[PDB]
Amino acid sequence: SYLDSGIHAG
Amino acid sequence: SMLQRDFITALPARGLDHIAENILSYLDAKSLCAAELVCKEWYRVTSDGMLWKKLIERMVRTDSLWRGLAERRGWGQYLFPPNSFYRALYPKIIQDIETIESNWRCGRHSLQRIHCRSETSKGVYCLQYDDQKIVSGLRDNTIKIWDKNTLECKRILTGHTGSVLCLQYDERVIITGSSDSTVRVWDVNTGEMLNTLIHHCEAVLHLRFNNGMMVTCSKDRSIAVWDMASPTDITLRRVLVGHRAAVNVVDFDDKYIVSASGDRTIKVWNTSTCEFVRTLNGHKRGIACLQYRDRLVVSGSSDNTIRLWDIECGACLRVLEGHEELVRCIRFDNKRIVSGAYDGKIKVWDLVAALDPRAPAGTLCLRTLVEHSGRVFRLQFDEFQIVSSSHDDTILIWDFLN
Amino acid sequence: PSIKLQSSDGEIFEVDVEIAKQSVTIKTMLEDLGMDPVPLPNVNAAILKKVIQWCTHHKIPVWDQEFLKVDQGTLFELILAANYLDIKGLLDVTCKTVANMIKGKTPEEIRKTFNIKNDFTEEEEAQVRKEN
Ligand SMILES: O=C(O)c1cccc(NC(=O)c2c(Sc3c(Cl)cccc3Cl)cc(C(F)(F)F)[nH]c2=O)c1
Ligand SMILES: [Cl-]
């Protein structure tokens, strides 16, 4: 899921 | 004292025609038609006063839809040709609006597709557009400027050492935030790099700026508030801390700064003082996207829902269900919400209906638009079109005018 | 300070300088012509008192709507005074009031509101009607 550098959580 | 008085006849009789014209300028179209048929002198006042021209001009001044059509259709050239020309034009404009509104409701559009032709790391994380250009930020570390009309690439800006995650521009500067944890400032005309802000400890995920101030936010869980005296003179005013995970998006106006985070919350801050105001709770997973204007906050979440909020009391006014994956970008105007999801789909929502608690939920999603083959990262829209970009390395222009 | 206004009748009103100067016209006569008192040949005492009352209160709300519950002849005189004195605020609410009496009505209902005779020929009316 980290293949999206634009958003993050945790 | 006379009981009754024909204002519209009496005023021109005394050499005060403009007062009579000003009274009639307040009429809506249908009442202006009625006024025309009251009597010959009323007709003459409306006709010699060019009231239909003034009515179209008042619409262009007060309604971006009418303004956009004046430019796109070319009849705006005649504004600011006899009175009868504008009277005959007015119903054509109405019909034009109706067909545009119908195209939205029914999903009828033309489509332009830019292939960004990224050599290695594909995808377009962010974008902003005007009538001249599309400015786009890419996972290959560059900013590409596209000609809005010819769809050709007019400029590539290099300098970031990671993905360009967020961007905004105005008449003077482009400001970009990057996975390389920096904010950069570029000249919108020449592309020359003018400034670099070293501050955040992790990827800069979002930024907004306006009227001499900027807000930035980061995977490092902080928000930075900046004062911009000029492209080259930018000072840190305050750091806002309190989020327990990455801050994915920030928006603001003169009342409030609004931030949202992987920690499942929206936080509201006082723009003047930078003091915490309140937390908006309710999403069941992290928040991926947000826009804030007036009193309305609209947020999109990993929980696959959209929420509408009043900024003053923090109440959630409406939950929008229907997306089948993470809601990754969202915008709204006066009529619609437009949202994009991880499954490549874009949805159009009826914002008025959504803000009316009588309306049932199933009537709220107006259309689903399926033309991307990857996650939708960013979109912007107006009365006539949507511009969207995706992990699939394309930018789409969805045009509802024809 | 107070300045005396002199109505077309001759009745003189003492008015505070800051109330008076909402009329640019009266302001010009004070500041540029240095006139005292200020003659107003186009405004009689009855309308002038109505105008002074409106200007003090405002040093289109609900109070103005109640203030404008007068016959059309008086509203017409008020429009003229507001024009002559160039009190844009008063001119706007009175003009908006007339527009509100026009909007949402058929031509026949407008005529009846203002006591206006329909003077179109049948041919002329049909033509005007065809063009809507
Ligand atoms: O404890 C629970 O009940 C539970 C159980 C399963 C899942 C979750 N939630 C999430 O996995 C999640 C992710 S994942 C992710 C990441 Cl980290 C990076 C890039 C892309 C993605 Cl999709 C991202 C966000 C956002 F804030 F970014 F939007 N929010 C979230 O909630 C919670
Ligand atoms: Cl997680």
C-alpha torsion sign, points B202, B205, B209, B215: negative
Q: Are B295 and B255 in contact (CB under 8 A)?
A: no
In this structure, what token pair is assigned to residue B118? 């990224």
Q: Are B69 and B79 in contact (CB under 8 A)?
A: no
B10, B26, B38 member nearest C110 (Cβ): B38
Number of Cβ atoms within 10 Å of the Cβ of A7? 26
- Domain final residue, candidates B103, B135, B165: B103
Q: Give the neighbours of chain A: at least 3 Cβ pairs within 8 Å.
A: B
Element housing B30 (H / E): helix B29-36
Q: Taking each helix axis as running N to C, give the angle between helix B64-73 and helix B51-62, from 0 to 180 degrees, rounded to the nearest 10.
A: 110
Q: Tokens 């994009």 sit at which residue?
A: B340
Chain A, 1 to 10: residues with Cβ < 8 Å from chain B are 3-10
Find the angle CA(B18)-CA(B23)-CA(B25) to the nearest 5 degrees. Answer: 90
How far apart CA B187 and CA B185 sit, in angstroms, is 7
C-alpha torsion sign, points C61, C62, C65, C66: negative
* Chain breaks in chain B following residues, C–N > 2.5 Å: 80
Specify the DSSP class assigned to residue B76.
G
Distance of CA B92 to the CA centre of its chain: 26
Element housing B385 (H / E): strand B385-390
How far apart CA A10 and CA A1 sit, in angstroms, is 12
Right CATH number for C1-132 from 3.30.710.10, 3.40.50.2300, 3.90.1200.10, 3.40.50.720?
Answer: 3.30.710.10
Residue B131 and residue B74 share a domain:
no
- Report the structure determination method: X-ray
Q: Are B314 and B284 in contact (CB under 8 A)?
A: no
- Domain final residue, candidates B70, B103, B136: B103
Number of Cβ atoms within 10 Å of the Cβ of B361? 13
Element housing B17 (H / E): helix B17-24
b/e sequence B262-290, b meaning 16+ C-beta within 10 Å = bbbbbbbbebeeeeebeebebbeebbbbb
C-alpha torsion sign, points B70, B71, B72, B75: positive
Residue B90 and residue B114 share a domain:
no
Find the angle CA(B363)-CA(B367)-CA(B371) to the nearest 5 degrees. Answer: 155
Residue B327 and residue B197 share a domain:
yes
Residue B390 and residue B311 share a domain:
yes
Contacts 24+ apart (CB under 8 A), B177-183: B177/B203, B177/B204, B177/B205, B177/B206, B177/B207, B177/B216, B178/B141, B178/B203, B178/B204, B179/A5, B179/B203, B179/B204, B180/B141, B181/B218, B181/B220, B183/B207, B183/B216
Pairwise CB contact (< 8 Å): A6 & B125 = yes
Number of Cβ atoms within 10 Å of the Cβ of B95? 10
Number of the ligand closest to the Cα of B263: 1
For residue B339, the SS3 value is strand
Residues in chain B: 402
Distances (CA, A) of B309 to B254, B313, B318, B401, C60: 18, 9, 7, 31, 31
Residue B113 and residue B99 share a domain:
no
Concatenating the DSSP letter of every residue in B100-130 gives HHHHHHHT--EEEEEE---SSS--EEEEEE-
How far apart CA B152 and CA B150 sit, in angstroms, is 5
Any idea what the CATH number is for the domain that residue B384 is in? 2.130.10.10
Ligand 1 pocket member A5 (CB < 6 A): no
Per the structure, the count of domains in chain B is 2
Residue B96 and residue B111 share a domain:
no
At C38, which amino acid appears? V
Residue B94 and residue B108 share a domain:
no
In terms of DSSP bridges, do strands C38-40 and C2-7 run parallel, antiparallel, or are they unpaired? parallel
Q: Are C38 and C51 in contact (CB under 8 A)?
A: no
At B385, which amino acid appears? Q
Ligand 1 pocket member A4 (CB < 6 A): yes
How far apart CA C85 and CA C47 sit, in angstroms, is 12
Distance between B89 CA and the closest CA of chain A, angstroms: 47
* Cross-sheet strand order for the sheet of B306-310: B287-293, B296-301, B306-310, B316-320
CA of B326 to the centre of ligand 1 (A): 9
CA of C82 to the centre of ligand 1 (A): 65
Q: Residue B210 is part of which domain span?
A: 104-398
Pairwise CB contact (< 8 Å): A8 & B262 = yes
CA of B302 to the centre of ligand 1 (A): 6
CB under 8 Å to A4, separation ≥6 — which residues? B328, B375, B377, B391
Ligand 1 pocket member B288 (CB < 6 A): yes
Residue whose C-alpha is closest to residue B389's, from B200, B69, B163, B203: B163
Pairwise CB contact (< 8 Å): B263 & A7 = no
Closest ligand 1 atom, CA of A7? 27
Ligand 1 pocket member A1 (CB < 6 A): yes
Nearest CA to ligand 1 atom 25: B286
Residue B152 and residue B20 share a domain:
no
Ligand 1 pocket member B305 (CB < 6 A): no
Q: Which residues of chain A does B179 touch, with a Cβ-Cβ cutoff of 8 Å?
A: 5
Q: Which residues of chain A does B139 touch, with a Cβ-Cβ cutoff of 8 Å?
A: 5
How far apart CA B44 and CA B36 sit, in angstroms, is 8
Residue whose C-alpha is closest to residue B235's, from B186, B194, B197: B197
Number of Cβ atoms within 10 Å of the Cβ of B195? 16
Residue B72 and residue B136 share a domain:
no
B4, B34, B38 member nearest C72 (Cβ): B4
Ligand 1 pocket member B164 (CB < 6 A): no
At B150, which amino acid appears? T
Resolution (A): 2.4
- DSSP E strands in chain C: the ranges are 2-7, 12-16, 38-40
How far apart CA C107 and CA B39 sit, in angstroms, is 9
How far apart CA C95 and CA B25 sit, in angstroms, is 10
In terms of DSSP bridges, do strands B256-261 and B124-129 run parallel, antiparallel, or are they unpaired? unpaired
Specify the DSSP class assigned to residue B60.
H
Element housing C116 (H / E): none
**Test mutation, B14, B32, B37, chain C, max C CBs within 10 A:** B37
Residue B130 and residue B50 share a domain:
no
- Domain final residue, candidates B103, B132, B147: B103
CB under 8 Å to B169, separation ≥6 — which residues? B128, B135, B175, B188
The pair phi, psi for residue A7, each rounded to 5°, is: -130, 160
Q: What are the residue ranges spanned by the domains of chain C? A: 1-132
Concatenating the DSSP letter of every residue in B126-186 gives EEEE-SSEEEEEETTS-EEEEETTT--EEEEE---SS-EEEEEE-SSEEEEEETTSEEEEE
Q: Are B322 and B305 in contact (CB under 8 A)?
A: no
C104, C107, C114 member nearest B6 (Cβ): C114
Report chain C's terminal Cα–Cα distance, integer Å: 57
Residue B355 and residue B225 share a domain:
yes
C73, C74, C96 member nearest B26 (Cβ): C96
How far apart CA B297 and CA B334 sit, in angstroms, is 13
Number of the ligand closest to the Cα of A8: 1
At B392, which amino acid appears? D
Establish whether chain A is in contact with chain B, requiring a minimum of 3 CB pairs below 8 angstroms.
yes
For chain A, the helix, strand and coil percentages under 3-state DSSP, each to the nearest 5: 0, 0, 100
At C10, which amino acid appears? G
Distance between B204 CA and the closest CA of chain A, angstroms: 8
Q: Which residues of chain B does A3 touch, with a Cβ-Cβ cutoff of 8 Å?
A: 391
Bin C41: left if φ > 0, else alpha if -120 < ψ < 50, else beta. alpha
Distance of CA B239 to the CA centre of its chain: 27
Bin B17: left if φ > 0, else alpha if -120 < ψ < 50, else beta. alpha
Any idea what the CATH number is for the domain that residue B69 is in? 1.20.1280.50
Pairwise CB contact (< 8 Å): C124 & B40 = yes
Using a 10 angstrom Cβ sphere, with 0-12 exposed, 13-18 middle and 19 or more buried, the burial of residue B17 is middle
Q: Are B255 and B311 in contact (CB under 8 A)?
A: yes
Element housing B207 (H / E): strand B204-210
Pairwise CB contact (< 8 Å): C73 & B4 = yes
Pairwise CB contact (< 8 Å): A8 & B263 = no
Residue B201 and residue B73 share a domain:
no
Closest ligand 1 atom, CA of A3? 19
